[PDB]
């Protein structure tokens, strides 16, 4: 419940909520870290291989 999350330096880091795994947020180019949108969320799989 904090206003500004810190990131081991004087930086702003994203507070990863449920709202970061969307079709808009899919395929935004970025380093392997500082990134959201895991490929394996229970909301992202959407009952795959059914």
């Amino acid at each position: 419940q904090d206003p500004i999350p810190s990131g081991a330096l004087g930086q702003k880091v994203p507070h990863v909520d449920e709202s970061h795994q969307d079709l808009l947020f899919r395929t935004s180019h970025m380093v392997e870290d500082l990134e959201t949108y895991d490929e394996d969320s229970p909301i992202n799989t959407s009952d795959a291989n059914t």
């Binding site: 959407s46 009952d47 795959a48 291989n49 059914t50």
Partner: protein, 263 residues
């Protein structure tokens, strides 16, 4: 039910005086009453020709040279419609026999190369002289001689020269014969082949096409480079036909995640 879109009427008289009455409605089982002899019906234009001609019931007399090229012409007509009898251009008696009972008769005997047996002079002017002398002998009405485009009487090419020679000889011996000159042909400017056969059947049967030379050329004129890039007198308007255009004829991630693959 099928109608005679072939004919203009039901009772027709020919020129020689024979009375011909169409029976029933147009269709495969009926008989239009005309007897037609198509020289060269094994070939590429004659196939479409007596497809249209034996469709309604004109008794088509097919003179054949080889017994195997003629077989698919059996299924285009009813019982007794298409009739096969062998002939050779050389033997007079077979030409005499093939045009005994015909009302109309056409030749499309045309060969683009010399054989060891026939040169250009032998199949175009001289064979036509032969069979059209037989047509004059029997007084057959409506003789039609299909020729080539660029048929000049005197030309560097021997093919075109002899096509002009055949035209002049058949016009000399028979005055009532009609000679039609089509364009290049593309079945499957150039003209589509069903359009040439439709034009020829509309030549076949009406009056006031007699002793008239016809030019059958398509709508728009082409060059060979344009054609390969696409792959990669009286006209049609006499007989109420519009030929088809060559260009229109020319053709003639997530889901995979939610399917199953190893079962």
């Amino acid at each position: 039910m099928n109608s005679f879109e072939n004919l203009a009427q039901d009772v027709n008289i020919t020129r020689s005086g024979k009375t011909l009455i169409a029976k029933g409605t147009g269709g495969r089982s009926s008989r239009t009453g005309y007897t037609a002899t198509v020289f060269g019906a094994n070939g590429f234009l004659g196939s479409y020709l007596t497809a249209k001609l034996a469709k309604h019931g004109t008794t088509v007399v097919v003179p054949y040279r080889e017994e195997m090229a003629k077989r698919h012409l059996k299924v285009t007509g009813d019982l007794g419609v298409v009739n096969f009898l062998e002939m050779d251009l050389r033997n007079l008696e077979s030409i005499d026999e093939a045009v005994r009972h015909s009302d109309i008769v056409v030749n499309l005997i045309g060969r683009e190369y010399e054989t060891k047996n026939f040169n250009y002079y032998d199949v175009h002017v001289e064979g036509a002289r032969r069979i059209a002398e037989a047509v004059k002998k029997h007084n057959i009405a409506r003789y039609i001689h299909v020729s080539a485009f660029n048929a000049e009487i005197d030309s560097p090419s021997e093919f075109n020269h002899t096509k002009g020679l055949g035209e002049q000889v058949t016009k000399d011996i028979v005055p009532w014969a009609t000679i039609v000159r089509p364009a290049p042909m593309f079945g499957r400017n150039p003209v589509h082949v069903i359009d040439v056969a439709a034009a020829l059947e509309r030549i076949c049967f009406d009056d006031s096409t007699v002793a008239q030379t016809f030019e059958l050329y398509g709508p728009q004129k082409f060059t060979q480079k344009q054609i390969i890039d696409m792959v990669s007198a009286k006209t049609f308007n006499d007989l109420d036909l519009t030929p088809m255009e060559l260009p229109d004829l020319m053709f003639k991630e997530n889901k995979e995640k939610t399917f199953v693959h190893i079962l």
